[PDB]
């Protein structure tokens, strides 16, 4: 069974995709960007932007019968790898106890010209 | 069991990889590029190029006992994010009913200097 | 059950992540870079750098009750796609018999300004 996930506490998915999709115990979360649930961009520091991305992921996971503690793998895409040090401070605050596998890469550009995008693969609770 | 997949209706894999690999109900499809099954590049619009990538994915999925409707997650890599609007028109045509999770990023370069690469994770029918 | 993996025969993970994480038969390996297990960068040819990345992945897999022969999907990120030909020679040497699915993309930058990063998804033996 493939089950799409929708929450009002993350920016809405466009017509062609879902915020997350569940398949046999796994939860695949779409790449989250620094936008509020009302679909407005977060302006400010990378730290503020990272915190929004984390809240977006967390809320989609909660709707997926999952949580940060059930994440298996995180992929981080940064528009500028110079921002990695700052991003990592926020990342470490969230993954203080649970330590999923991770990959981080510097990309040329991201949707809507944002500074970061983060996708996650998790398991159901 | 890990089962490699081969179809003559997508560009052939090189010696070191498989077009797709199956593992416990999941199908992992290699990143598909805008090349025809005869291994020639598609020249033309991003729309034409995206349509070829979609046909490549669809045909590999069919050989994998899967289909577009069984996709869990799509990752789109674009050489230029300015092409995203055009790409999205084609994407939305295919994912008109089934809405997998998605991530899209702008990369510096792609194999054989192509404009787009798309990988997919699916489940068996 | 989510089980983190640690080996002394790959560069140590930082505090916020694990070298690999196991979840229901799958092993998700963090993106490996050309650093030795003593956390020093490999200087030299792309071939030498690729060989180090391969040894890092192999050793994490071994600690994960897996191996190269149990890999389902490989994602290769290169800081310069001009290095792909050279990388591929090393890749083909390792995947001489087992042929997982693969995606390869050229990125803007990688952690610690390295030339390549490779992540892998595998199954347990």
CSV table of C-alpha atoms in Angstrom, one decimal:
chain,number,residue,atom,x,y,z
A,1,UNK,CA,0.0,0.0,0.0
A,2,UNK,CA,1.2,3.5,-0.9
A,3,UNK,CA,-0.3,6.2,1.3
A,4,UNK,CA,0.2,9.9,0.6
A,5,UNK,CA,0.6,12.2,3.6
A,6,UNK,CA,-0.8,15.7,4.1
A,7,UNK,CA,-0.4,18.1,7.0
A,8,UNK,CA,-1.6,21.7,7.3
A,9,UNK,CA,1.5,22.4,9.6
A,10,UNK,CA,3.9,22.3,6.6
A,11,UNK,CA,3.9,24.2,3.3
A,12,UNK,CA,1.3,22.6,1.0
A,13,UNK,CA,2.5,20.3,-1.7
A,14,UNK,CA,1.8,21.4,-5.3
A,15,UNK,CA,-0.7,19.3,-7.4
A,16,UNK,CA,1.8,16.8,-8.8
A,17,UNK,CA,3.4,15.5,-5.5
A,18,UNK,CA,2.8,14.7,-1.8
A,19,UNK,CA,4.5,16.1,1.3
A,20,UNK,CA,5.3,12.4,2.1
A,21,UNK,CA,4.5,8.9,0.9
A,22,UNK,CA,4.4,5.7,3.0
A,23,UNK,CA,5.4,2.3,1.6
A,24,UNK,CA,5.9,-0.8,3.7
A,25,UNK,CA,6.9,0.8,7.0
A,26,UNK,CA,9.0,3.4,5.4
A,27,UNK,CA,8.1,7.1,5.1
A,28,UNK,CA,9.6,9.1,2.2
A,29,UNK,CA,9.4,12.9,2.9
A,30,UNK,CA,9.7,15.4,0.1
A,31,UNK,CA,12.5,17.8,0.2
A,32,UNK,CA,11.5,20.6,2.6
A,33,UNK,CA,12.5,24.2,2.1
A,34,UNK,CA,12.5,27.3,4.4
A,35,UNK,CA,8.8,28.3,3.9
A,36,UNK,CA,6.1,28.6,6.5
A,37,UNK,CA,2.9,26.6,6.4
A,38,UNK,CA,1.2,29.6,4.9
A,39,UNK,CA,3.5,29.2,1.9
A,40,UNK,CA,5.6,32.3,2.6
A,41,UNK,CA,9.4,32.3,2.5
A,42,UNK,CA,11.5,32.6,5.6
A,43,UNK,CA,13.9,35.5,5.4
A,44,UNK,CA,16.8,35.8,7.9
A,45,UNK,CA,19.7,33.7,9.0
A,46,UNK,CA,20.6,30.2,7.8
A,47,UNK,CA,19.8,29.2,11.5
A,48,UNK,CA,16.3,30.6,11.3
A,49,UNK,CA,15.8,28.9,7.8
A,50,UNK,CA,17.1,25.6,9.1
A,51,UNK,CA,14.8,25.7,12.0
A,52,UNK,CA,11.8,26.1,9.7
A,53,UNK,CA,12.9,23.2,7.5
A,54,UNK,CA,13.2,21.1,10.7
A,55,UNK,CA,9.7,22.0,11.8
A,56,UNK,CA,8.3,21.2,8.3
A,57,UNK,CA,9.9,17.8,8.4
A,58,UNK,CA,8.8,17.1,12.0
A,59,UNK,CA,5.2,17.9,11.2
A,60,UNK,CA,5.1,15.8,8.1
A,61,UNK,CA,6.6,12.9,10.1
A,62,UNK,CA,4.0,13.3,12.8
A,63,UNK,CA,1.2,13.0,10.2
A,64,UNK,CA,3.0,10.0,8.9
A,65,UNK,CA,2.9,8.2,12.2
A,66,UNK,CA,6.7,8.8,12.6
A,67,UNK,CA,9.0,11.3,14.2
A,68,UNK,CA,12.6,12.6,14.1
A,69,UNK,CA,13.6,9.6,16.3
A,70,UNK,CA,12.5,7.2,13.5
A,71,UNK,CA,14.6,8.8,10.7
A,72,UNK,CA,17.0,6.4,8.9
A,73,UNK,CA,18.7,8.8,6.5
A,74,UNK,CA,18.9,12.5,5.9
A,75,UNK,CA,20.0,14.2,2.7
A,76,UNK,CA,20.9,17.9,3.0
A,77,UNK,CA,21.2,20.1,-0.1
A,78,UNK,CA,22.8,23.5,0.4
A,79,UNK,CA,23.0,26.3,-2.2
A,80,UNK,CA,26.3,27.4,-0.6
A,81,UNK,CA,28.5,25.0,1.4
A,82,UNK,CA,29.9,28.0,3.3
A,83,UNK,CA,26.6,27.9,5.2
A,84,UNK,CA,27.3,24.4,6.3
A,85,UNK,CA,28.9,25.3,9.7
A,86,UNK,CA,25.9,27.4,10.6
A,87,UNK,CA,23.4,24.8,9.4
A,88,UNK,CA,25.2,22.1,11.4
A,89,UNK,CA,24.7,23.9,14.7
A,90,UNK,CA,20.9,23.7,14.2
A,91,UNK,CA,21.2,20.1,12.9
A,92,UNK,CA,23.1,18.9,16.0
A,93,UNK,CA,20.5,20.5,18.3
A,94,UNK,CA,17.8,18.3,16.7
A,95,UNK,CA,19.8,15.1,16.3
A,96,UNK,CA,21.1,15.3,19.9
A,97,UNK,CA,20.3,11.7,20.7
A,98,UNK,CA,19.2,9.9,17.6
A,99,UNK,CA,21.9,9.8,14.9
A,100,UNK,CA,20.7,8.8,11.4
A,101,UNK,CA,22.9,8.4,8.4
A,102,UNK,CA,23.5,11.7,6.5
A,103,UNK,CA,24.7,13.1,3.2
A,104,UNK,CA,25.3,16.7,2.5
A,105,UNK,CA,26.1,18.3,-0.8
A,106,UNK,CA,26.4,21.8,-2.3
A,107,UNK,CA,24.1,22.4,-5.3
A,108,UNK,CA,24.0,25.0,-8.0
A,109,UNK,CA,20.4,26.1,-7.2
A,110,UNK,CA,17.3,25.1,-5.3
A,111,UNK,CA,13.5,25.5,-6.0
A,112,UNK,CA,12.3,29.1,-5.5
A,113,UNK,CA,16.0,30.2,-5.1
A,114,UNK,CA,16.0,29.0,-1.4
A,115,UNK,CA,19.2,28.4,0.6
A,116,UNK,CA,18.6,24.8,1.7
A,117,UNK,CA,16.5,21.8,1.0
A,118,UNK,CA,16.3,18.7,3.3
A,119,UNK,CA,14.8,15.3,2.6
A,120,UNK,CA,14.4,12.4,5.0
A,121,UNK,CA,13.6,8.7,5.0
A,122,UNK,CA,12.0,7.4,8.2
A,123,UNK,CA,10.2,4.4,9.6
A,124,UNK,CA,6.7,4.3,11.1
A,125,UNK,CA,6.6,4.3,14.9
B,1,UNK,CA,17.4,-11.4,-3.2
B,2,UNK,CA,18.8,-8.7,-5.3
B,3,UNK,CA,17.5,-8.8,-8.9
B,4,UNK,CA,19.0,-6.7,-11.7
B,5,UNK,CA,16.6,-5.4,-14.4
B,6,UNK,CA,17.3,-5.0,-18.1
B,7,UNK,CA,15.0,-3.7,-20.8
B,8,UNK,CA,15.7,-2.9,-24.5
B,9,UNK,CA,13.1,-0.1,-24.4
B,10,UNK,CA,15.5,2.2,-22.4
B,11,UNK,CA,19.1,3.2,-23.0
B,12,UNK,CA,21.4,0.3,-22.1
B,13,UNK,CA,23.3,0.4,-18.8
B,14,UNK,CA,27.1,0.5,-19.0
B,15,UNK,CA,29.1,-2.5,-17.8
B,16,UNK,CA,29.3,-1.4,-14.1
B,17,UNK,CA,25.6,-0.9,-13.3
B,18,UNK,CA,22.0,-2.0,-14.0
B,19,UNK,CA,19.0,0.1,-15.2
B,20,UNK,CA,17.2,-1.0,-12.0
B,21,UNK,CA,17.8,-3.3,-9.0
B,22,UNK,CA,15.1,-5.0,-7.0
B,23,UNK,CA,15.4,-5.6,-3.2
B,24,UNK,CA,12.5,-6.8,-1.0
B,25,UNK,CA,9.5,-5.4,-2.8
B,26,UNK,CA,11.4,-2.1,-3.7
B,27,UNK,CA,12.6,-1.2,-7.2
B,28,UNK,CA,15.6,1.2,-7.4
B,29,UNK,CA,15.8,2.8,-10.8
B,30,UNK,CA,19.1,4.3,-12.0
B,31,UNK,CA,19.0,8.0,-12.9
B,32,UNK,CA,17.5,8.2,-16.4
B,33,UNK,CA,18.7,10.9,-18.9
B,34,UNK,CA,17.2,12.2,-22.2
B,35,UNK,CA,18.6,9.5,-24.5
B,36,UNK,CA,16.6,7.1,-26.7
B,37,UNK,CA,16.8,3.3,-26.4
B,38,UNK,CA,19.3,3.3,-29.3
B,39,UNK,CA,21.7,5.3,-27.1
B,40,UNK,CA,21.3,8.6,-29.0
B,41,UNK,CA,20.8,12.0,-27.3
B,42,UNK,CA,17.4,13.7,-27.5
B,43,UNK,CA,17.9,17.2,-28.9
B,44,UNK,CA,15.1,19.8,-28.6
B,45,UNK,CA,13.0,21.4,-25.8
B,46,UNK,CA,13.1,20.5,-22.1
B,47,UNK,CA,9.6,19.2,-22.6
B,48,UNK,CA,10.7,16.7,-25.3
B,49,UNK,CA,13.7,15.7,-23.1
B,50,UNK,CA,11.5,15.2,-20.1
B,51,UNK,CA,9.1,13.1,-22.0
B,52,UNK,CA,12.0,10.8,-23.1
B,53,UNK,CA,13.2,10.5,-19.5
B,54,UNK,CA,9.7,9.5,-18.4
B,55,UNK,CA,9.4,6.8,-21.1
B,56,UNK,CA,12.8,5.5,-20.0
B,57,UNK,CA,11.7,5.3,-16.4
B,58,UNK,CA,8.3,3.8,-17.3
B,59,UNK,CA,9.8,1.0,-19.4
B,60,UNK,CA,12.3,0.1,-16.8
B,61,UNK,CA,9.5,-0.1,-14.2
B,62,UNK,CA,7.4,-2.3,-16.4
B,63,UNK,CA,10.4,-4.7,-16.7
B,64,UNK,CA,10.6,-4.5,-12.9
B,65,UNK,CA,7.0,-5.6,-12.4
B,66,UNK,CA,6.2,-2.1,-11.4
B,67,UNK,CA,4.7,1.1,-13.0
B,68,UNK,CA,4.5,4.9,-12.5
B,69,UNK,CA,1.5,4.3,-10.1
B,70,UNK,CA,3.8,2.3,-7.8
B,71,UNK,CA,6.5,5.0,-7.4
B,72,UNK,CA,7.2,6.1,-3.8
B,73,UNK,CA,9.8,8.8,-4.4
B,74,UNK,CA,11.2,10.8,-7.3
B,75,UNK,CA,14.4,12.7,-7.3
B,76,UNK,CA,14.9,15.2,-10.2
B,77,UNK,CA,18.2,16.8,-11.0
B,78,UNK,CA,18.3,19.7,-13.3
B,79,UNK,CA,21.4,21.3,-14.9
B,80,UNK,CA,19.5,24.6,-14.8
B,81,UNK,CA,16.6,25.4,-12.4
B,82,UNK,CA,15.3,27.9,-14.9
B,83,UNK,CA,14.0,24.8,-16.8
B,84,UNK,CA,12.0,23.7,-13.8
B,85,UNK,CA,8.7,25.4,-14.9
B,86,UNK,CA,8.9,23.7,-18.3
B,87,UNK,CA,9.8,20.3,-16.7
B,88,UNK,CA,7.0,20.6,-14.2
B,89,UNK,CA,4.4,20.8,-17.0
B,90,UNK,CA,5.5,17.4,-18.3
B,91,UNK,CA,5.8,16.0,-14.7
B,92,UNK,CA,2.3,17.0,-13.8
B,93,UNK,CA,0.9,15.3,-17.0
B,94,UNK,CA,2.4,12.0,-15.8
B,95,UNK,CA,1.7,12.3,-12.1
B,96,UNK,CA,-1.9,13.4,-12.7
B,97,UNK,CA,-3.4,10.9,-10.2
B,98,UNK,CA,-0.6,9.2,-8.3
B,99,UNK,CA,1.4,11.7,-6.3
B,100,UNK,CA,4.7,10.3,-5.0
B,101,UNK,CA,7.1,12.3,-2.7
B,102,UNK,CA,9.6,14.4,-4.7
B,103,UNK,CA,12.8,16.3,-4.4
B,104,UNK,CA,14.2,18.6,-7.1
B,105,UNK,CA,17.7,20.2,-7.1
B,106,UNK,CA,19.8,22.3,-9.5
B,107,UNK,CA,23.2,20.6,-10.2
B,108,UNK,CA,26.4,21.9,-11.7
B,109,UNK,CA,26.6,19.2,-14.4
B,110,UNK,CA,25.1,15.9,-15.4
B,111,UNK,CA,26.5,12.8,-17.2
B,112,UNK,CA,27.1,13.4,-21.0
B,113,UNK,CA,26.3,17.1,-20.4
B,114,UNK,CA,22.5,16.4,-20.4
B,115,UNK,CA,19.9,18.9,-19.1
B,116,UNK,CA,18.1,16.5,-16.7
B,117,UNK,CA,18.4,13.3,-14.8
B,118,UNK,CA,15.6,11.6,-12.9
B,119,UNK,CA,15.8,8.7,-10.5
B,120,UNK,CA,12.8,6.9,-8.9
B,121,UNK,CA,12.2,4.4,-6.1
B,122,UNK,CA,9.1,2.2,-6.6
B,123,UNK,CA,7.4,-0.9,-5.2
B,124,UNK,CA,6.5,-4.1,-7.1
B,125,UNK,CA,2.9,-4.4,-8.3
C,1,UNK,CA,14.6,-1.3,15.1
C,2,UNK,CA,17.1,1.3,14.0
C,3,UNK,CA,20.7,0.3,14.6
C,4,UNK,CA,23.5,2.8,14.2
C,5,UNK,CA,26.8,1.4,12.8
C,6,UNK,CA,30.4,2.4,13.8
C,7,UNK,CA,33.7,1.1,12.5
C,8,UNK,CA,37.2,2.3,13.3
C,9,UNK,CA,38.2,1.4,9.7
C,10,UNK,CA,36.5,4.4,8.2
C,11,UNK,CA,36.7,8.1,9.1
C,12,UNK,CA,34.7,8.7,12.3
C,13,UNK,CA,31.2,10.3,12.1
C,14,UNK,CA,30.7,13.7,13.8
C,15,UNK,CA,28.5,13.9,16.9
C,16,UNK,CA,25.2,14.5,15.0
C,17,UNK,CA,25.2,11.4,12.6
C,18,UNK,CA,26.3,7.8,12.2
C,19,UNK,CA,28.5,6.2,9.5
C,20,UNK,CA,25.5,3.9,8.7
C,21,UNK,CA,22.0,3.2,10.0
C,22,UNK,CA,20.1,-0.1,9.7
C,23,UNK,CA,16.4,-0.4,9.3
C,24,UNK,CA,14.4,-3.5,8.4
C,25,UNK,CA,17.1,-5.4,6.4
C,26,UNK,CA,18.3,-2.2,4.7
C,27,UNK,CA,21.6,-0.5,5.5
C,28,UNK,CA,21.9,3.3,4.7
C,29,UNK,CA,25.5,4.4,4.5
C,30,UNK,CA,26.4,8.1,5.0
C,31,UNK,CA,28.1,9.8,2.1
C,32,UNK,CA,31.8,8.8,2.2
C,33,UNK,CA,34.6,11.2,1.2
C,34,UNK,CA,38.3,10.6,0.4
C,35,UNK,CA,39.6,10.7,4.0
C,36,UNK,CA,41.5,8.0,5.8
C,37,UNK,CA,40.3,6.4,9.0
C,38,UNK,CA,42.6,8.7,10.9
C,39,UNK,CA,40.5,11.6,9.6
C,40,UNK,CA,43.2,13.0,7.2
C,41,UNK,CA,42.4,14.0,3.6
C,42,UNK,CA,43.7,11.9,0.7
C,43,UNK,CA,45.7,14.0,-1.7
C,44,UNK,CA,46.5,12.7,-5.1
C,45,UNK,CA,44.6,11.4,-8.2
C,46,UNK,CA,40.9,11.0,-8.5
C,47,UNK,CA,41.7,7.2,-8.8
C,48,UNK,CA,43.5,7.2,-5.4
C,49,UNK,CA,40.6,9.3,-3.9
C,50,UNK,CA,38.0,7.0,-5.3
C,51,UNK,CA,39.8,3.9,-3.9
C,52,UNK,CA,39.7,5.4,-0.4
C,53,UNK,CA,36.0,6.2,-0.7
C,54,UNK,CA,35.4,2.6,-1.7
C,55,UNK,CA,37.4,1.2,1.2
C,56,UNK,CA,35.4,3.5,3.6
C,57,UNK,CA,32.1,2.2,2.2
C,58,UNK,CA,33.3,-1.4,2.2
C,59,UNK,CA,34.4,-1.2,5.8
C,60,UNK,CA,31.1,0.4,7.0
C,61,UNK,CA,29.2,-2.3,5.1
C,62,UNK,CA,31.2,-5.1,6.8
C,63,UNK,CA,30.3,-3.6,10.2
C,64,UNK,CA,26.7,-3.5,9.1
C,65,UNK,CA,26.6,-7.2,8.3
C,66,UNK,CA,26.6,-6.4,4.6
C,67,UNK,CA,29.1,-6.1,1.7
C,68,UNK,CA,29.6,-4.5,-1.7
C,69,UNK,CA,27.7,-7.5,-3.2
C,70,UNK,CA,24.6,-6.6,-1.2
C,71,UNK,CA,24.4,-3.0,-2.5
C,72,UNK,CA,21.1,-2.0,-4.1
C,73,UNK,CA,21.8,1.6,-5.1
C,74,UNK,CA,24.8,3.9,-5.3
C,75,UNK,CA,24.7,7.7,-5.6
C,76,UNK,CA,27.9,9.4,-6.7
C,77,UNK,CA,28.4,13.1,-6.3
C,78,UNK,CA,31.4,14.7,-8.1
C,79,UNK,CA,32.7,18.2,-7.7
C,80,UNK,CA,33.7,18.1,-11.3
C,81,UNK,CA,32.1,15.8,-13.9
C,82,UNK,CA,35.3,16.0,-15.9
C,83,UNK,CA,36.6,13.5,-13.3
C,84,UNK,CA,33.9,11.0,-14.1
C,85,UNK,CA,35.9,9.0,-16.7
C,86,UNK,CA,38.7,8.5,-14.2
C,87,UNK,CA,36.3,7.7,-11.4
C,88,UNK,CA,34.5,5.2,-13.5
C,89,UNK,CA,37.6,3.1,-14.1
C,90,UNK,CA,37.8,2.5,-10.3
C,91,UNK,CA,34.1,2.0,-10.0
C,92,UNK,CA,34.1,-0.7,-12.6
C,93,UNK,CA,36.9,-2.5,-10.9
C,94,UNK,CA,34.8,-2.9,-7.7
C,95,UNK,CA,31.5,-3.5,-9.4
C,96,UNK,CA,33.0,-6.2,-11.7
C,97,UNK,CA,30.3,-8.8,-10.9
C,98,UNK,CA,27.5,-7.2,-8.9
C,99,UNK,CA,25.8,-4.3,-10.7
C,100,UNK,CA,23.6,-2.1,-8.5
C,101,UNK,CA,21.5,0.7,-9.7
C,102,UNK,CA,23.5,4.0,-9.9
C,103,UNK,CA,23.0,7.8,-10.2
C,104,UNK,CA,25.8,10.2,-10.8
C,105,UNK,CA,25.6,14.0,-10.6
C,106,UNK,CA,28.0,17.0,-10.7
C,107,UNK,CA,27.6,19.3,-7.6
C,108,UNK,CA,28.8,22.8,-6.9
C,109,UNK,CA,30.7,21.8,-3.7
C,110,UNK,CA,31.2,19.0,-1.2
C,111,UNK,CA,32.0,18.9,2.5
C,112,UNK,CA,35.6,19.9,3.4
C,113,UNK,CA,36.0,20.9,-0.3
C,114,UNK,CA,36.6,17.2,-1.4
C,115,UNK,CA,36.3,16.0,-5.0
C,116,UNK,CA,33.8,13.2,-4.5
C,117,UNK,CA,31.2,11.8,-2.1
C,118,UNK,CA,29.5,8.4,-2.5
C,119,UNK,CA,26.5,7.1,-0.6
C,120,UNK,CA,25.1,3.6,-0.8
C,121,UNK,CA,22.0,1.7,0.1
C,122,UNK,CA,22.5,-2.0,0.8
C,123,UNK,CA,20.8,-5.1,2.3
C,124,UNK,CA,22.0,-7.2,5.2
C,125,UNK,CA,23.7,-10.5,4.3
